[PDB]
Structures are given as C-alpha cells and as structure tokens.
Design a protein around this ligand. Structure first.
Ligand SMILES: [Mg+2]
Ligand SMILES: [Mg+2]
Ligand SMILES: [Mg+2]
Ligand SMILES: [Mg+2]
Ligand SMILES: [Mg+2]
Ligand SMILES: [Mg+2]
Ligand SMILES: [Mg+2]
Ligand SMILES: [Mg+2]
Ligand SMILES: [Mg+2]
Ligand SMILES: [Mg+2]
Ligand SMILES: [Mg+2]
Ligand SMILES: [Mg+2]
Ligand SMILES: [Mg+2]
Ligand SMILES: [Mg+2]
Ligand SMILES: [Mg+2]
Ligand SMILES: [Mg+2]
Ligand SMILES: [Mg+2]
Ligand SMILES: [Mg+2]
Ligand SMILES: [Mg+2]
Ligand SMILES: [Mg+2]
Ligand SMILES: [Mg+2]
Ligand SMILES: [Mg+2]
Ligand SMILES: [Mg+2]
Ligand SMILES: [Mg+2]
Ligand SMILES: [Mg+2]
Ligand SMILES: [Mg+2]
Ligand SMILES: [Mg+2]
Ligand SMILES: [Mg+2]
Ligand SMILES: [Mg+2]
Ligand SMILES: [Mg+2]
Ligand SMILES: [Mg+2]
Ligand SMILES: [Mg+2]
Ligand SMILES: [Mg+2]
Ligand SMILES: [Mg+2]
Ligand SMILES: [Mg+2]
Ligand SMILES: [Mg+2]
Ligand SMILES: [Mg+2]
Ligand SMILES: [Mg+2]
Ligand SMILES: [Mg+2]
Ligand SMILES: [Mg+2]
Ligand SMILES: [Mg+2]
Ligand SMILES: [Mg+2]
Ligand SMILES: [Mg+2]
Ligand SMILES: [Mg+2]
Ligand SMILES: [Mg+2]
Ligand SMILES: [Mg+2]
Ligand SMILES: [Mg+2]
Ligand SMILES: [Mg+2]
Ligand SMILES: [Mg+2]
Ligand SMILES: [Mg+2]
Ligand SMILES: [Mg+2]
Ligand SMILES: [Mg+2]
Ligand SMILES: [Mg+2]
Ligand SMILES: [Mg+2]
Ligand SMILES: [Mg+2]
Ligand SMILES: [Mg+2]
Ligand SMILES: [Mg+2]
Ligand SMILES: [Mg+2]
Ligand SMILES: [Mg+2]
Ligand SMILES: [Mg+2]
Ligand SMILES: [Mg+2]
Ligand SMILES: [Mg+2]
Ligand SMILES: [Mg+2]
Ligand SMILES: [Mg+2]
Ligand SMILES: [Mg+2]
Ligand SMILES: [Mg+2]
Ligand SMILES: [Mg+2]
Ligand SMILES: [Mg+2]
Ligand SMILES: [Mg+2]
Ligand SMILES: [Mg+2]
Ligand SMILES: [Mg+2]
Lengths: 177, 260
RNA sequence: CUCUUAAGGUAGCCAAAUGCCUCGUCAUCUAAUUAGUGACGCGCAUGAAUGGAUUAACGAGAUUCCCACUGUCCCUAUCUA
RNA sequence: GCCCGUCGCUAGUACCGAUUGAAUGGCUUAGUGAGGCCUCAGGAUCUGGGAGAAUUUGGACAAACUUGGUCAUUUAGAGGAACUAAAAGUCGUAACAAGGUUUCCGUAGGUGAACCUGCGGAAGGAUCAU
RNA sequence: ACCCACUCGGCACCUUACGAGAAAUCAAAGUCUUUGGGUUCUGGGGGGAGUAUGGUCGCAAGGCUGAAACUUAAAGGAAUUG
RNA sequence: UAUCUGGUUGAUCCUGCCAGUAGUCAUAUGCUUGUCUCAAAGAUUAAGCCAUGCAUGUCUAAGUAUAAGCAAUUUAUACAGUGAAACUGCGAAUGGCUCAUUAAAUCAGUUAUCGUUUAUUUGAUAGUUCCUUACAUGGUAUAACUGUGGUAAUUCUAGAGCUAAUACAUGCUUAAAAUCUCGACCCUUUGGAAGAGAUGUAUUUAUUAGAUAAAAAAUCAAUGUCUUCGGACUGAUGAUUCAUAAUAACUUUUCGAAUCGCAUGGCCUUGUGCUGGCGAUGGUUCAUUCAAAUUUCUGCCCUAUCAACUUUCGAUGGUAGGAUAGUGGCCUACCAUGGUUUCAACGGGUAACGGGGAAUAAGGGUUCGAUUCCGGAGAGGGAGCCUGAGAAACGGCUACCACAUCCAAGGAAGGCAGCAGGCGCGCAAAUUACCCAAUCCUAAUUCAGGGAGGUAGUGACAAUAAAUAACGAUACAGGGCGGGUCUUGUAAUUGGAAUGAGUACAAUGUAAAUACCUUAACGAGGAACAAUUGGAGGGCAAGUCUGGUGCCAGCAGCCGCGGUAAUUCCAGCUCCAAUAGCGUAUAUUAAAGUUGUUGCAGUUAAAAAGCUCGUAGUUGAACUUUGGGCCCGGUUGGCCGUUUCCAACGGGGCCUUUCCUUCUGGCUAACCUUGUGGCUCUUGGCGAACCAGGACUUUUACUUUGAAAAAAUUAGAGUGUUCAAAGCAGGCGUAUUGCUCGAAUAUAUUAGCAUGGAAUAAUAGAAUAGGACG
C-alpha cells in the first residue's frame, strides 16, 4: 500500500582490496583534506565514474546530437556552478579528465581551510560540526557541503557561534566563575 | 473480481493530476459521470491541489456543501465529480470561471475566463443516430444528448452548447483545415488545424496536424477535437497556445526571464 | 608349511523332498508361527546326463499366505424323504 | 624408483534385495450417495382459480464414503555387491627400461590375485631404411 | 614399348615458412582478438563409471541409450634437464 | 564500468579445475554499537492450528415516530421539536491478506462485441391506463411495543394483543389530430356515406419499410392525389436482417408517481372552486460514465529415461434445439470423421502465480521477482446456493470430509492467507498500544463508520548524512639557513578555549502524545562520554618480537603450518584493512572466452559416429533500369556582418521506349501557360495531390519514421532537502489582504497498427499456350 521510498548507495568499492599502491595513495588524500572514512574517498570516486560514464557516453553521439548538447551543456553547467571544472573547459571533452582531487578541494571542510580560518584542515572539520560557521543565517554542519563558488563569497561565521560574534560560550562562562 | 472497484491507490492515479506520492496511500477515485475516469479530473484536486483554495480534503467537502461550486451551470456537489476537458467551473464566490483545458504538457491547467465565455460549451460529437419515435440526437465527448440537431452535423464535429438550456446553435465541421485540439496520446495539448485524414477502413483513422509553427505531427482521430478556424478559435486557449516548445526551447526561455 | 591321493568337489546350489546338531542364525509374515518365504553356509553327508543350475506352460501332485465364501467353529436349533 | 590387483581393519556414500514392502499428494473406473437448485405431486391454513409449510416424484449439479487402478514425490529392509577415504599392512610383480614374455585394442576362455593364452588389429615400438 | 614437355585427377615424399601451435610438429593443424563461406557431430577438472536405473536390440555373449550420491587438488598434454 | 592472483614440475610452457577476489532490494547467524534522516519486517518451513479483543455499518428540510422517550415551547386538538427501538432503503461484491493451485492457463502488449450484462453517475425520454367505475386518493398484515412463556446454553425464539409506509398488495386519469377497420340507409354508378370501434410504451411472433453502380419503357393483379373524363399522374457503418418505422396479432401484461420537504400565492361567476413556486424520492426506455463477461494476434521455465496424442463418458466439424446476459460442443439429439504433433504435440517436472520490475556495470549476457503498482486465484479442503446491479461471497448460508469448542449428555456453536496476539514449524521475521488529524472510502450521508489508512512502540532488513576531539606554550632533539625563530614535530607537568551524547524550564511538534528542528539551565580530561571487527608465511596489507605447546592441542576457503629456537597454533606486545560497523554460512552475478550469437575447445590434454546412404532441420552460383540530362529547394560551414559568391551533405520531381492500377467527376498545385535578378496577374492548355463511388489488385522477409502508448523503477533536466539518501517542490514584493516559474525529457526493443525505402533473401508468372493486349 505504501508508496516505495526510493534509496541509493553513494560509494563504490575497489575490486582488488589490497592494492597498497592505491592504498597509501588513498590515505594521502584522506589525511590531506581531513577525511574520516576512506569511504569519503570511495564515495567521491563513485559520482566521478558516474559523470564519466555519463559524459564519455555523450561523446559517442554524432557531434552535437540533439540530447548530447541539452544534457551536455546541462552537465558542464552543473560542475562549474560548483567550481570543479574551470571556466575554460565547458565543451565537455575535458570533463572526462576531472581527476578526483578537484572534487575534494571544493568541499566545505576544505575551503574553510584555504580561506585561512582553519588553523588545521581538522580544526575545520571540528568547528563546522559545533554550531559554528554558516553561509547565510543558514548554519552548515556538513563538512561535505560542496560549496558552489557563488556562496563561497559569504562563509564568515554564524551569528550564534561564539567564534564569529556571540555570547561567550558554554565552558568559558564558568571558567570565569 | 466480484463487481465494482471503488478505491484508487496512489500511482494508479492519472499522472496529469500531479499528486505527490507520499500523502497517504490513495488518490480520490473519480465518480461516474460525464467524463471517462482516466480522462478527467475531480473537484477535490482542483480545489485542493492545482488551485490551493482548500488545505485538506475535509475542507473541500465543507466548501461544496454551501453550493459554492457550479460546473457547466449546475451545483454539482460530488467531491470526486469527474470534471473533464472543456467543462466550465463557475465559482459563486469570487465570481470566477474556468474552462477545463490541457497544457501542451498534457495536464489540466487553471485558465480563468470571462463571464460571457462562461456560458457556452462545445463537444466533439461521438455519435449520431435516430432514436425513440425517430427523433435524431447527438451525443458528445462530455456525456449529453441533444435532440433534434441539423442533418448537417455528422460525427466528429464540435457543437456550441448554450448550457443555460440544452440546444446547439453552431457546429464546426471536421474537414481539411479546421482548428483542432489534440485530446489524447501525448501530442496531447498541441494545436492546429488540419493536414488530412487517412481513412483505414477497419479502424483507427489517422489525423495529420500542422501546428502554427510549421511543425507536423499525427495522432488518432478519436483524439482530435476540431475547435474552429485557423487562428480563429471558438474558446480562449491558455498561455502559449500549445505549440510544443522543445526541451532546449523551453529552457532557453526559462533562463530568458533571468533578471529580478 | 606339512602328511597324503587315481584325483582330492570346479561352475553352480542349499537347513533345499538332501543338515546330524536343529524348533540352526538373521530377516520377513502374526497378538503370538517346531509352519511358510528371503537370506546366511567348514554343507553330519549339496553338486554337475549318479546329470548341475535355470525355466514359460501344464498338474484330481506336496506346502504357505491372502480375497471371497461359508454351521468347520463359538453353539446349537429347525424342516423334508 | 615407481607401481598393480585380490586379501584384512575403520568409516561414509549410493546401488541390488524376500517383505505382491510402506508413505504422501494428483487424477480416476465401479458401487453407494449428502445437499441446495430445477421439476411432478402434496395441502398444516388463508384466503381470492391464488398463495403456502411439512411431505414427495423425476432431474441436472454434485460433495463425500467403500474397494480398486494410475501418475508423481518419497521411503524401511536380513543380506548381497560396488566405490571412496586410502597414502599404508598381507601376497605376489602386471605396467613403466626390449620392465626382463614390448605395450595397448576388440573378442574368447582360463587363473588366489594382479594376470595368462588363442584369433584379428594399432604403434601411442624396441623398426620412418635393401 | 621407350624419351621429352605440358595439363587434368590419384597414392605419397621433399625443402621451406609467409603462417599456425603449449609444444612435438602442420600446405593445413594456415588464411582467428584484424575473432563470421556452408553444414553435421562430440567435449566442459579428476575419480566415481560407461557403473546404477529405465527403455530398446540380441539365442546368448553382449550392443545402443545412459545418471546420481559421495569423494578429491589435482589427473592430464607436450617439451627441458637430470 | 573492457585487470586478475595462489595450487600439478627438479625447473618449463600448456589444458584445466580448485582456492582467492567484488557486488547482491539477499536471507540467516556471530561479535560490536553514540547522533540525524529514512523505515522493510511470520514470504521461504506448515494455503499448518488458533484463546481473546477488534476489522461494516449507515439518516437528510425532505419514506415510516401515539417511546406509557428527553424536552417544552409556542398559532398549531390529526402530525410538527428532539429522537431509542423497529421497519423501509442502501452498503456489506470495495477494502485488507495470502501465493496454495495454475505451464497455452494466468499474464503482457495488441485486438473483437455487427457476440452480451451493466446498480450507480451524468444527459435525455411519457396528454393515451375506462367502457357496447372512490381521485377531495381505494386493501390488510406486521416489526418495534405491550404482555404471557420455554430452554444448561447463542445475535434461539413461541403463544396472544396492537399500529405505520417511498414495505406489501392494489387501482382512476387528459387536448387535438389523423390513419386504419367494420359499416344502417341510397343506387345502380366513375360508385359514397351517417357513425361503430380500433390505434400509449414494454413483451412475443410473423410480414413490411429501411433507397441510391449511369439511364428508360410495356403489361397482369390490385389501386392512390388532381379531372381539361381523350386521360395524365430519406440516417449511420469498411460491413448487417443496423438505428428507426409500418402492418396482424400475442401477453397469468413492464412502465405510465395513491410519495416526501420548504415555502404559500394568486384569481371570480367567492364554489372548501379553480389554480400555482422552488427541490426531493421514484419511474420505464435511450445515452453516458464505473464496469463486467467473453475474444484476435504474438510471446512462457527444465524434460525424449515423455512420440505419438485426442473421442470411456465431446475428441474436430455440420444441422436443429436447449440453456446462457449473450457467442460457442457450453449442453443435447441426429449425422460425419475429424483435431494436435520433431516447427516437439502428448505426458512429466516446477523447492511456478504472471507482469511493472530486482541483482550483476565493456558489450553480448546471467540470475531473480512470495513481497508497496496492475492482472489473476483463494479464504481448512470440496461442492452447492440464497440475496443482489454485481458473489458460486465464505469476517453469507447448505451438505459432505478434516479440524475443532461449550453442555445440565437433551443439545448448541466455531473458519485470522484482516489488525494484533498465541501454538507449531524452523536458519528465519515486531505491539494483544493510539486516532479518524491526514490520505481516501461507504451510508439515508458536511456530522456516522473505516485494525482501509495514519500515530507511536518493537526494529544494525536495507539506504543517507558522519562524534569519539580541536589549538596552543614549553622542554630536551632532529632538521632549516652553535641551537636561532622558520616548525618537522617526539614530548608521560601544563593550557585556557569549543561542544553534543546525555539531561531539561519552554515553546514548537502532535488527534493526544513521542522524536526531530529551535533553545535557557546543566552537561569532557584519561576513572574518560574509554570503537569495533577481523587479520599480520603466500594469494594479501601488516613482525622469521617475547612467552607457551611439542605432529599434542589447535590453525589452515586453497598452497600449507605444529614432531622443542613456530614468520601460521595459545598469548603479551607491536603492526595492517575496513570502520558504526565488521566476520561466518548459503545462494547468486561479475571475473568466465570454464556454456563461447558476439566468443571456446575436439592430431597427441576432455571430445570427430567404423563406413556410406538419407528424411526432418540448417544452407544454397550467377544474370531483369543501369547510365546520362534538366530542375526545385532544403542543412551544416565558409568570406563577409540573410540577398546573393564559393565548396561539401542530404530530399523530392522530371525527360531519357520507362504503372504511378484503374477509370467515371470532383481539386486542379503546378506550366509549355498569356532584364528572365522580381511577382502579383483571367480567357485556350500538367495530373494522379486524394478525396468517393466503381471496377481489380502475386505473395513475404528486412529497414525507416510515426502513432498507440500507467504510474512508481531506471536514465535524466530544474530546484541549494543546513548536506546527502530524498522530496516535487519552490522562488519573488508592496512580507497591508500577491507576484510568479514549475511538476521536463528520455524509455517498449518481441507482436499488432501506420508510413517512407526497393539494395539484400525468398514466392509466384507464357512451353501441349488453357498465355497477353482489343
Ligand atoms: Mg469517490
Ligand atoms: Mg561357481
Ligand atoms: Mg524341509
Ligand atoms: Mg526358541
Ligand atoms: Mg519358521
Ligand atoms: Mg498357519
Ligand atoms: Mg529356506
Ligand atoms: Mg547346506
Ligand atoms: Mg556336526
Ligand atoms: Mg560330498
Ligand atoms: Mg548325487
Ligand atoms: Mg539340463
Ligand atoms: Mg529356460
Ligand atoms: Mg497344483
Ligand atoms: Mg516346502
Ligand atoms: Mg500387505
Ligand atoms: Mg427441470
Ligand atoms: Mg559407485
Ligand atoms: Mg614387471
Ligand atoms: Mg623388478
Ligand atoms: Mg612385459
Ligand atoms: Mg614399453
Ligand atoms: Mg599433379
Ligand atoms: Mg618455426
Ligand atoms: Mg612459428
Ligand atoms: Mg528379451
Ligand atoms: Mg603442491
Ligand atoms: Mg614443487
Ligand atoms: Mg631434483
Ligand atoms: Mg570461487
Ligand atoms: Mg505461511
Ligand atoms: Mg509478507
Ligand atoms: Mg490457516
Ligand atoms: Mg414526538
Ligand atoms: Mg478485494
Ligand atoms: Mg480471463
Ligand atoms: Mg394477509
Ligand atoms: Mg441510407
Ligand atoms: Mg431490429
Ligand atoms: Mg388559497
Ligand atoms: Mg524420469
Ligand atoms: Mg453445433
Ligand atoms: Mg475416428
Ligand atoms: Mg525437444
Ligand atoms: Mg507453487
Ligand atoms: Mg541488460
Ligand atoms: Mg555464467
Ligand atoms: Mg510478483
Ligand atoms: Mg517467477
Ligand atoms: Mg511460496
Ligand atoms: Mg465459498
Ligand atoms: Mg476472517
Ligand atoms: Mg471478504
Ligand atoms: Mg436438561
Ligand atoms: Mg497475524
Ligand atoms: Mg531477521
Ligand atoms: Mg492498523
Ligand atoms: Mg496499521
Ligand atoms: Mg564511544
Ligand atoms: Mg574527556
Ligand atoms: Mg585485535
Ligand atoms: Mg605483505
Ligand atoms: Mg600471534
Ligand atoms: Mg566487505
Ligand atoms: Mg552477432
Ligand atoms: Mg575450453
Ligand atoms: Mg591417452
Ligand atoms: Mg572418423
Ligand atoms: Mg545415425
Ligand atoms: Mg543468391
Ligand atoms: Mg518513437
């Protein structure tokens, strides 16, 4: 009777499970952008392989086939609108080539670091969670925002966060009492 | 299976009613009436979903029981009444009137119309034959029988309906070059006015249509609804007059209205 | 290995109408079977035209069980000549 | 060195097998036949030729019970006969070296056991050759 | 009858290897990952086992058809060195 | 998103399997478990059995109220408000559950009714009812009720006394008109008449009309309007016996309002006269809509250790009937001997409901679908049936079988594959809770009812987001270029910061709660708010550390480890992988080109029948309008910033001896038509462009495009759910009384339909001419 609540998975999994070449490599990415799960990496490989064998499929169509452009130009719009594809690259032969790290450097937990304002890449992840920084009045506690380079302009802290103008905060207030 | 089904699950509901899946389990099963079940729309969705006058279903019943609503003239208090294409819904409060007319996306659109226009009607005649005592009658897409029409009305033609009373006065004909309205398939919504009609004795005569953008298409004759003369209709078409904007056409103009 | 023979019972088959022991042992049929049947075999003392083994068909032949049937019986009673 | 078979131990699997063996389902002959329905009657009454209960005739439909048959799916069994684990132990030496009678195939008979012998083949021979 | 030359169709041999193959070797076993001329048949690890079971042919011996349970990490091929 | 790796050997290359590996809307179990969202869940085994409670009832101004009912008000002395009980009506055939049976059945896509039923909704439709008489309105016979009773016992009911109707059962009515039938008289002719009845709809039958391929005459039997007395004189379909109508009758004669509510008014010739408003229930017949029932074409899994099957006792057809709502061997009677099959019939199997779909990502495939949506089947097993529009119903009845409860032993009652809960079965699956607030549904109906449905609980089924920490200062130390001033940081004292997990005023949330969102007060330093699960010889990432054991115990998916220094066991330590999760078993997909159409292998590794014939099946050489010319205008891109100029890529039509079926008119859009860049313009003259009627057509396969096409699923656009899985929203002002975009697109592909193409591959054609045009 119920209508079926749709779901899906967000992470693939390496077939060879112990390729230490790719396993060190995986961790360098992990301990760089501040990730907890190697499946935060496996996750963002997944969409990439989707974008690719979405995109790779379009360059088979006869050049400028009706739908190849509609969702072609729909695709490259989506990725510059988050700023992973750079503005030179909006004719979609180069979207096949989005090496993974581009996606990670466009996180929230990442740019909150590259804007200064994160002493470490992990001071980032720790304050995002804790009622700290926002974009509008809209607090965000998801270190995987994928900020869209438009709203990257306003990433100052929140008004209720006692690091960007607030009341003292919970344990300060009786360190002083 | 032991007689009449009287329930309608969701996702059995007609898509063009645009109900969200999770609001329960069921759509409102339209009642029996003028319009085919799958080819109609009930009052409770009109007053609740597309037009958002009422919040819940319980309210829609409260609304109708005050004789507020009229369709084609009459009080018509059936919460699930099968109101269909080309009906008129006068609304006593607000002095609003709506003719029921498709988009070119094929759904039922909200379309306010004049008080003058709110008192005539058309119908694709679906049958014509003699009857009791030999008085001929026409019957049309909407479920009414007009006794004593002219011998010149054959079948497949539209008819003006006074609907303060019964009779017809004018009857547009089905010939090469009359304004048509596709009322099925999903060329549903597109418009205009002939190319020609392939006979195909045995069934399923094919109707060729040329929209007023020099774009052809074909649909079956059962689903072509002549509505008059080139560019000269006999009712008020809705916005964009059904000329099947492309996906890129539609989103090029989608971003044409770009600056606030 | 050994004594010994003319040769030392092969293929087959069995408590077989051939087995003492013996109402053999195991199974089977039964409530219960010195019965029957199927198995077993150092078989007192099975065995090859002393013919061996197997066999459809046949039998007023010996034997076991089932169905039907019944005064054979429980348990006797009555009639006719 | 390798290695074959009978023979003996332990364990497991499946097979054959007296029990005219057992069990579960699907049909189904023949026999008996509930019930409601249709129908011939009936006439407690209850009425203006009608009604109508009990009862009843004959039907089609047909559960079901008794005894069979058939199909499918299972399955107990004295005992018999395989295989395996399995490499070993007993007896021998079959094959592998011309394996000490070259080997193998088909067929036939014989032998504790591998095996032996006859007839015709093959070389994968131990001979690409007068 | 013999000699010489050519040409059809035979039984084979020889030299090559373009080519093939795991190799031994192969004018097919070639013209296959640059994979498609037509068509028939069989095989899918080794044992179990061509056993069991049914069907069928036979006078018989046996022929054709022909499983599974279980067991097992090999068994096999060609070549190299000992 | 096109990958391999470990194991045959002394070493080698193979064939080959085993093991490894990864996924699973895939079940289970094990260890571990904090937050948000999401939210499947007694399918598998046993469609096995069920205690108890609940899951279907329903009233409007408008069928029935003398409750000895409450309430009194209020014009109301018939009724009137309110209304239990009860009748009447309607519903109970939807829903929800389960997957047992079912293999040409269901189902799917595509059809058919000119092959039928159709409550309801919606739209139409009724001057006729009598007779050679209540219409100011006709009849009892009953519930409730009262009262007397029975029984251990039930939604048991008996005897008696009342009374209602939109229940039951009856039974009047209305204009004109015309057409048919009889026809007393009169009067004989060319012949006509007074008035007598008949003629609603529905049923049954027979007869007729229902035209139409282009035009005309003569006559026999009747016999219609006008005499200038010779005489003259129209529906639909491709398609019907269709719609409709006419005639003679037929009928235990259908319907044709004895109903109800709100108002009450006109109009005298003042009659209890005559009239008349709005809307409710009904009522035939037609149409509509919701349906149903059959039905066309094509498509199912394994099986030949199933080859013949179908008529006993219908098998295949014919005729006639019967029965049905209707077609039909559905059934019967008579007659015939047919029907299916290697192009796999028939039988068997199925741990089989079908589908939408799910899993697995080079592709081609392989596997799965009890399970939210559609269809079907069932309600312990059968069969039978009442009611009804609709049921072969089971929260209906009846019978049998099985199960099974109560008892006073006489009898009575039960059907969870509804909700929950219980027993059983098993590897295997949750509360005997809350609400009609939403979603919808039903009733007499805005109100009542709804275990449909939604709420919470249970809930590591799956799915998403992602806490268990974050910055210092210092101190020996490295290293930058003696430690100096740049941190690599390893530090076993420190340090002030931050926060939800939790807790909790509060508001929010909600039907009432609960959580979540928001938020005072609390709420973190190692004792913590303390992460797990596996593993560390190889495949395979991480130690030949230490202790134990001594072929023991144990490990080891596989190769292999342990018999006294164990890289493998039991541990301590350290280390790796994944991480709120991770291991194990079973299945399954990838890897697997080990099922091979794509795409395998067959000399010796597994595998060419000893041999040839040979039916089925598969396959099968070549050759029939090619080539040339005129034209039209399309779509990219170029030089220019679309007219014309260049290339190239496609569409059509022409003429080249050149069906394009074909005419009979209707049509003509086009020209041979009447300074050629440019086009209006009637008076001779294009065909096929297709209407619609006629006549007549060799059969296919393939490919194009298109229609028909359910949602959810999938692919995918838009949208910043705080992110994400999702959802189908949302976004703007004048946020004082509105503005506005949406809710795409794609996808079906086998079969059917429609359409363009004429290569490729078939079929057919003139040879005894029984040929072709006329
Ligand atoms: Mg409804
Ligand atoms: Mg012997
Ligand atoms: Mg004896
Ligand atoms: Mg004894
Ligand atoms: Mg005995
Ligand atoms: Mg005896
Ligand atoms: Mg004996
Ligand atoms: Mg003996
Ligand atoms: Mg003795
Ligand atoms: Mg003797
Ligand atoms: Mg003797
Ligand atoms: Mg003899
Ligand atoms: Mg014999
Ligand atoms: Mg005898
Ligand atoms: Mg005897
Ligand atoms: Mg017996
Ligand atoms: Mg009868
Ligand atoms: Mg065996
Ligand atoms: Mg030897
Ligand atoms: Mg030797
Ligand atoms: Mg020898
Ligand atoms: Mg040799
Ligand atoms: Mg030669
Ligand atoms: Mg070579
Ligand atoms: Mg070579
Ligand atoms: Mg024989
Ligand atoms: Mg080894
Ligand atoms: Mg080795
Ligand atoms: Mg060696
Ligand atoms: Mg494996
Ligand atoms: Mg069950
Ligand atoms: Mg279930
Ligand atoms: Mg049950
Ligand atoms: Mg009263
Ligand atoms: Mg149902
Ligand atoms: Mg059916
Ligand atoms: Mg009476
Ligand atoms: Mg006509
Ligand atoms: Mg008729
Ligand atoms: Mg009056
Ligand atoms: Mg069999
Ligand atoms: Mg017949
Ligand atoms: Mg016959
Ligand atoms: Mg076959
Ligand atoms: Mg089944
Ligand atoms: Mg696929
Ligand atoms: Mg496979
Ligand atoms: Mg299903
Ligand atoms: Mg299935
Ligand atoms: Mg099942
Ligand atoms: Mg039933
Ligand atoms: Mg029930
Ligand atoms: Mg039911
Ligand atoms: Mg008693
Ligand atoms: Mg239950
Ligand atoms: Mg579970
Ligand atoms: Mg519930
Ligand atoms: Mg519920
Ligand atoms: Mg913790
Ligand atoms: Mg702490
Ligand atoms: Mg550990
Ligand atoms: Mg390693
Ligand atoms: Mg250890
Ligand atoms: Mg894993
Ligand atoms: Mg192919
Ligand atoms: Mg192979
Ligand atoms: Mg060999
Ligand atoms: Mg051969
Ligand atoms: Mg043969
Ligand atoms: Mg050819
Ligand atoms: Mg299409």
């Amino acid at each position: 009777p119920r209508a079926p609540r749709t779901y899906s998975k967000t992470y693939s999994t390496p077939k060879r499970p112990y390729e230490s070449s790719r396993l060190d490599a995986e961790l360098k990415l992990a301990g760089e952008f501040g990730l907890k799960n190697k499946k935060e990496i496996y996750r963002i490989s997944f969409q990439l392989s989707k974008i690719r064998r979405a995109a790779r499929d379009l360059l088979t169509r006869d050049e400028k086939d009706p739908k190849r452009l509609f969702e072609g130009n729909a695709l490259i719009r989506r990725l510059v609108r988050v700023g992973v594809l750079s503005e030179d690259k909006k004719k979609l032969d180069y979207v096949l080539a989005l090496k993974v790290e581009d996606f990670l450097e466009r996180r929230l937990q990442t740019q909150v670091y590259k804007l200064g304002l994160a002493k470490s890449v992990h001071h980032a992840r720790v304050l995002i969670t804790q009622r700290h920084i926002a974009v509008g009045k809209q607090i965000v506690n998801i270190p995987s925002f994928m900020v869209r380079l438009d709203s990257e302009k306003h990433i100052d802290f929140a008004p209720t966060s006692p690091f960007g103008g607030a009341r003292p905060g919970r344990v300060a207030r009786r360190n002083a009492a | 299976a032991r007689g009449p089904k009287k329930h309608l699950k969701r996702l059995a509901a007609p898509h063009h009613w645009l109900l969200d899946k999770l609001s329960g389990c069921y759509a409102p099963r339209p009642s029996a009436g003028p319009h085919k079940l799958r080819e109609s729309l009930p009052l409770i969705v009109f007053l609740r979903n597309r037009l958002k006058y009422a919040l819940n279903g319980r309210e829609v019943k409260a609304i109708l029981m005050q004789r507020h609503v009229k369709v084609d003239g009459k009080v018509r208090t059936d919460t699930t009444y099968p109101a269909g294409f080309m009906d008129v819904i006068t609304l006593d409060a607000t002095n609003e009137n709506f003719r029921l007319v498709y988009d070119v996306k094929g759904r039922f659109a909200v379309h306010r119309i004049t008080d003058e226009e709110a008192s005539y009607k058309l119908g694709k005649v679906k049958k014509v034959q003699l009857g009791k005592k030999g008085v001929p009658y026409v019957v049309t897409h909407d479920g009414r029988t007009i006794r004593y029409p002219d011998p010149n009305i054959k079948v497949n033609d539209t008819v003006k309906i006074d609907l303060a009373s019964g009779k017809i006065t004018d009857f547009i004909k089905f010939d090469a070059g009359k304004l048509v309205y596709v009322t099925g398939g999903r060329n549903l919504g597109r418009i205009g006015t002939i190319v020609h009609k392939e006979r195909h004795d045995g069934g399923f005569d094919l109707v060729h249509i040329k929209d007023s953008l020099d774009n052809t298409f074909v649909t079956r004759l059962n689903n072509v609804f002549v509505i008059g003369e080139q560019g000269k209709p006999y009712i008020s078409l809705p916005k964009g007059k059904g000329i099947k904007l492309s996906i890129a056409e539609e989103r090029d103009r989608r971003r044409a209205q770009q600056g606030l």
